[PDB]
């Protein structure tokens, strides 16, 4: 478990295409599976459950454009440490066949998904070919899945994770970038309500 | 016609019952019909309903034998034999993990469709405890790394504080988490060599409230407690194996177990204070006191001084990695059960009440 | 031809006999015939007339067996075995409950047709004891709760007062009520560990008339009793299981039973005092003494000292809702029976007599 | 009817020199399970187990069904004990030390072998630390060994004297295991002394640990009855006459008390007692040894600098194959080659170098 | 099929072995084949090869039987039985004879074709020892005559002197010569009764390095030794039979054995002084020492302290008449063989080098 010299930025950059992120307001019930709290920029969701992330652009970018999804620890003190799966979860028979057993973030239902094990930064990530909003919808929705509860590394939210959604071309340059905090639990509803309740 | 000694032993082995009279009485209950077992269909004691059926036919005979007493012995010897053989071959960490697989194994009941404990109550105990000492979960964690490493002349912690300051509670708890025994080194010396054989094959040892000297100025009766430990330097060190002995039986030559010492602010000889790696000074905190007054259940049920309490605290704060691989699985299997059963916000509230001096459950 | 070990073991159970000798001499009593057993026609001792006939067919052989003592030993072991289980699985309340029924059963017989105890004389004793302490019944109830709860660091009551002031009388009766043992810490410390072992599997323990050091102005002999109690603070706290031995052997690591501690007006250290959750100061009262003088039968029949009297107080005062759901049925059955033979007028008169010190039944 | 083979058990107790009845009952019970399935064998973690299971697997099954396992294990132990009383009464002190050394090398082969965890580099790093404790250390270990082997009357004890945490213990412990003896505590009331002493029966050497003395009240050292008790055990420390060592209430031994070490703080050693001590080493606080350990945490953590192997090694390293008994000289050689093939004299020097500079041995 | 208990017994008798654990080991060696045994061909153990072939069958069977320890017992008891019958029937003189015989036997072998003993080295001891005291030969004899007559009130000799005065060496030699035991009366008086038991059925006893009072003026630690002796007056007296015990029971009432007492210039009470028929004051002699600092072998082999040496001395000096008829012949045999071995001039030389302190074998 080596640290990385690099530190991927989290600055919000819409870019020359006005890149944003849309989330499905799944209310704050009890049987919730994945929700979002605009006030917290936090996404409460369950373990290995579909997490629809909407891509909003004003002007459809060029072809071959990809969308990278990376995770880093919100707290600077551990921002140098590598975000990965717990010793247990990385030993589970939850191998979809494409996603490596140590990757936190995954993509569901996208055959052209590529998982990158950056040999220089040691960082883990997942990328998929950007697609234009299918007729009927104004945005491109991507399904993500986290394979590790935020409790496995601290419980009391000792190690907060932050997801980094990058929009880059074929070569791999920055075009747009948004980020939201992520929490994998067992009651996204109850947990969102209470936290927002804390003002 | 004849009893299956092997079977009785198999029972004691799954019960970890090293008590001839306990085992005797317990198995004898199996002598009755399992068809109308009131103790089973009511599921009160697992050590009973979980094995009665299987051991029914056997006990049915064991009850008419003329060697019940004896037959039970062997069974205990085996259990003891195992306890020994393990304290020699398994590693320290492989012992805590073995212990935890018994506490969590008990928790699987307390908090189940058969238990009788309020998971909510316990988490509160944790809350209270987590207000006793700064970074309590960390402290408890360090203690473990100090009891597993077992570094010679660095294997004992000292709790030195006033009367009713929590020192005993915490100790009593840790002692149950790792398993062990508590010895009274205050009594005479003419018969303390047996009161020491209790440390045989024990993970750790606890010397509850040791009376020293020179405390007259603080209205603390003088006792030969502290001075008795000094006469056991080779015990607390752990460099050489000392000789422990039980009443005309089992005179083991092992290396004394590590542990803690609790006393009422007496004077500690520089030759003993050196055998104490870390010294935590406890202070009577009023808010914690009142909190208990309004949270009586934490005492009546003995929770702030239970191992299961701290273990839970660990399943709560501590990362999965910290726990052994062969247990990380069962740990997450709980870190979720708790994550579900409770909420970060809810817990927050608890420690808040304790900090305010009110009942935890408000 | 052969003998049934099981039957004797069973008889020993229905009698809860843990004494091999007694068990022996007693079963052998079933040896002779029952058809004309004079000990049956007179109905003295239920332990005999209630089982003889049933065990006759197994006592005529036992009388010829060559292993009498060996057999009895197994029964007794079974008895102890039970006690052991019912101290690790039953609730302190369930224990205090099982105890009461045992007492009530005795009462039914001692107050029935075959009995010889005069309900009036006993009830009269209830009055004497009620004039011993302000709200005695409530104290008795308070004590019972204290013991059953067994709240750590809060398990012992202190009875302090001059010679002959009722300290014992009440302590003794309380003991018989819950069932326990009286220990002596004044004795040497080389037998101390053997004495403290008596308190095994016991509900509550009682340190009778402990001696202290400070106090010659009151013409009181010095003793090591108090100083001893201070050393056993581990035992009194009840927080961490202590190790108790027995018969130069290792028996069990249990939590020391709670109890009373009676003693003359000696000095008591702060550390020890703290172990006492309640202190009752008894003082010699003329009328109480003159009452017995004219009420001999109260001491002759050891009434004011038996727990049965205290029970005939909780039934004549405490509300049904306070007893364990299980015994409520029977309790009420007694409140009625007791009521039909005693008008609050008659009773009130008895307490009055005591106040005047002219004998209860006067 | 298929009965049990006591003889087979006895044999196991011997091939492992098991003196603990219960410990035996536990080891032999493990031979009850299937051999081909034993996970504790294919994994190789316990020699005492996998080296005899298959063999004793047959008898074990029968054993696990006997109504007196204890008896059998008892007679199997009463044997291993007899084979101890005999050797300690017929073999030469030289042979004993040799045998002890064999079992020491056996635990050394596996130890640094493929089927075992043990960094040969770590231990040598320890040997270096130890060789920095006292001038001409490797020589001291021999002078002690010889002194113990010769067993010269009124000349059999070494008095390791020093302050708190000076090494006394770490060494005394090493030599202890190196030869195979027992640590005794003569600080507790003598009213239990006769029993504590019984632990010395059939032992090679004996080590009286801290043994509290008296007079050192100016040094802030709690006075005890330790030293004073030794003075009462004069003939015990002498070695001329045979003593009567009591044990388990039944005297079963009238032998000469074995030699050994005696550690203590700056207390007063009475004229009559100081005489029973041949040599006296004065240990003192070694700051650099301390710093080194704080950076060589593994030394203390794995209990190397205080192991009977860290010392035997120091010998295999320095001492000539001559000083060793010719009944095990070959083995000693096979190791000398093995150690040099693995280490460079210039490297070992670098170790001590750091240990002197107060820096982590390795690297 | 059933081992011969009479064979293990016989062997024990033919080895005067009374140590059960030893007998078992010794015999367990004969279970193997003699045809190709090492220790048995290397002839380095008399008590082994002399009986292996005779005891081989009853050993391969014994190695099978389950009652091993039980057997060895029966055997050992037979031994103790014999010794017990000797002490009461044989005369004290005959006792010394039997001793000398067994003593000579050892010599015959250790000083024969098989054995590492060097007759020349030992002679040096005989010499060295003859320089330890004036008329050493007429002392050892005087001593033996004192231990044999065992006259009441005149049974003990007192060796008194500084450290390294040879007190022990001689004391030990005399002890081995007659065969007794070394009791430690310095230990606590509580257990003082167990050591005294070791003197049961012994020819003589030796109280090595007894500690006394009033030694600070000479740098000598206090002790209870002397006092304890002065409490066993009737023991040293030998006038009335004393009651000794060992196996936790009054095992035997006998006339305590006579002996020697070695102490370091402490204060002796006239009551204990009038109990010592003879006193010998030893003094540190430089030459004796230097002679040793060059003749190490004497110590590295425990010769000057051996009892065999003293027997060689008598054999060397003493006339063939002061001995026992039955042993006379054998005495001569050893006088002749001892003659052809050395010349009066050589022996004389030895003593010279001793007086010069240079090496008995220079
Ligand atoms: Zn995880
Ligand atoms: Zn049942
Ligand atoms: Zn009858
Ligand atoms: Zn196996
Ligand atoms: Zn042979």
Swiss-Prot record, chain A:
Organism of derivation: Homo sapiens
What outcome is documented for mutating residue 37 to Y in this protein?
Answer: In sporadic cancers; somatic mutation
Upon changing residue 60 to P, the result is: In a sporadic cancer; somatic mutation
- Altering residue 193 to S: what's the impact? In a sporadic cancer; somatic mutation
Indicate what this protein is called per its UniProt record: Cellular tumor antigen p53
Q: Does the keyword Amino-acid biosynthesis apply?
A: no
Q: What is the effect of changing residue 85 to G?
A: In LFS; germline mutation and in sporadic cancers; somatic mutation
Q: What is the effect of changing residue 169 to N?
A: In sporadic cancers; somatic mutation
Disease (UniProt): TP53 is found in increased amounts in a wide variety of transformed cells. TP53 is frequently mutated or inactivated in about 60% of cancers. TP53 defects are found in Barrett metaplasia a condition in which the normally stratified squamous epithelium of the lower esophagus is replaced by a metaplastic columnar epithelium. The condition develops as a complication in approximately 10% of patients with chronic gastroesophageal reflux disease and predisposes to the development of esophageal adenocarcinoma.
